[PDB]
C-alpha cells in the first residue's frame, strides 16, 4: 500500500509515527516497532514523531514503558499537536532529545474516564482514579522538572502551550529551526 510503503521506508530510517488517537491497537504497533528497531540496532536512536490528540492512558503507558526499557535513546518530535498522552509521550522522550516544531501546540490536562456500576464498583473505580491521577502527575512533574503541585493545578483543565511556552515549562528541550 502507498501510505504504508512510505511509513515503511521511514521505519527503516528509525523514524516512527504516532499520528492518531492512542488505542490499544496503535500502542501495540508502536511498542512492536520499538522492540523491532531496538533489536535491529541497540546503539542508534529512534525518532518518534507525534501528532496525536491523546487517548487511552493504559495504552499510552505501554508505549512509555517500552520507550524507557529500550536500550537506545528515543527522540521525540512534536509536530502540529501533542495532547494528553500525546504530550506525555513527547515529554517522556530521552532528555535533551525532545523537540518541538515551531507551530506545534501542546496540551496538558488531567485524565478523562467514566464511572459505571454499583456503588461498591464505583468506589473501586474512584480509588483507581486517585492512584492513576497521582502517578500521571508525578511523571509529568519528573519529565518537566515542575513541582507536582503546579502540574496538578495546571492540569485541572485544558492547559495549552505554544512551542515556546512548552520549552520553558520543560516538556521539550529544543525548538527546531530551518
Amino acid at each position: 500500500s502507498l501510505t504504508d510503503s512510505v511509513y515503511e521506508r521511514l521505519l527503516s530510517e528509525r523514524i516512527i509515527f504516532l499520528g492518531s488517537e492512542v488505542n490499544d491497537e496503535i500502542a501495540n504497533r508502536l511498542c512492536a516497532q520499538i522492540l523491532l528497531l531496538a533489536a535491529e540496532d541497540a546503539s542508534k536512536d529512534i525518532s518518534l514523531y507525534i501528532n496525536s490528540p491523546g487517548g487511552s492512558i493504559s495504552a499510552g503507558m505501554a508505549i512509555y514503558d517500552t520507550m524507557v526499557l529500550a536500550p537506545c535513546d528515543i527522540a521525540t518530535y512534536a509536530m502540529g499537536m501533542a495532547a494528553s498522552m500525546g504530550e506525555f509521550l513527547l515529554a517522556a522522550g530521552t532528555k535533551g532529545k525532545r523537540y518541538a516544531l515551531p507551530h506545534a501546540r501542546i496540551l496538558m490536562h488531567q485524565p478523562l474516564g467514566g464511572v459505571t456500576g454499583s456503588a461498591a464498583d464505583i468506589a473501586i473505580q474512584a480509588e483507581q482514579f486517585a492512584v492513576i491521577k497521582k502517578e500521571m502527575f508525578r511523571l509529568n512533574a519528573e519529565f518537566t522538572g515542575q513541582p507536582i503541585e503546579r502540574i496538578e493545578a495546571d492540569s485541572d483543565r485544558d492547559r495549552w502551550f505554544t512551542a515556546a511556552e512548552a520549552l520553558e515549562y520543560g516538556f521539550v528541550d529544543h525548538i527546531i529551526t530551518r
Binding site: 490536562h109 488531567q110 485524565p111 478523562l112 474516564g113 467514566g114 464511572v115 459505571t116 456500576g117 454499583s118 456503588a119 461498591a120 464505583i122 468506589a123 473505580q125 474512584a126 482514579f129 486517585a130 492513576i132 491521577k133 485541572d156 483543565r157
Partner: protein, 201 residues
Amino acid sequence: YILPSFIEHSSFGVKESNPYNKLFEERIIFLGVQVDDASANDIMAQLLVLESLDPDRDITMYINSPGGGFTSLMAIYDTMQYVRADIQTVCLGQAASAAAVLLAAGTPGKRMALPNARVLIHQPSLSGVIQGQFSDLEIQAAEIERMRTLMETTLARHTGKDAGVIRKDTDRDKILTAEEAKDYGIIDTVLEYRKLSAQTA
C-alpha cells in the same frame, strides 16, 4: 389501556370515577411504576394533598414497584415522614430497590405485605456510564457513597438493624419473602387472606 370507570349512587349526587381515584378517595396512594423523578413528584403531590385535605386520618400507600431513582427516594421518604398523618405501607407484590426502603419507612405498626410479596434490597446502582474528567468523577463517586450510606442509615433507623449490617447484607442483591421481610424488620405484619369462604379456619 383498558381501565374501566364507573359511577357512584348517593343522595347528594352522582359521580364518575376510576379505580385509582376511588382508591385515592380512600386515602390510598398507588405506587406502581418505576420511581422516576416525574412519578415521585406525583407521589409527593398526592401525599401533600391528602395531608392538606385531612391531616388526622391515615394515608395508605400501596406498593408494587420494580424499583427506582435514589435521587427521588429521599424526597418521597422525607415527605412521608414529614406529613402530619400516619403512613400505612402495603406491599402487594413487589417492593424493590427504593420501593423497599419506602415500604420500610411506613409508620411503625403499619407496614405490611401480602404473603407472596417479594422485597428486594440493593445498594444504589448507576447504569449508564457517566463520562468525565477525573475531578468530576471523584465528586460523583463521593456523592454516590454519601447516597449509599444515607440509604443504609435510613433503613437501619426503620428496621432496628445496625447500619454496618445493612451494608453487608445489601452489598449484593438481597431478596426477601414477606415472612423474611418481617423478620428483617421491613414490615410489621404479613396480611392474612380475608376471603369469606376460607373463613372456616
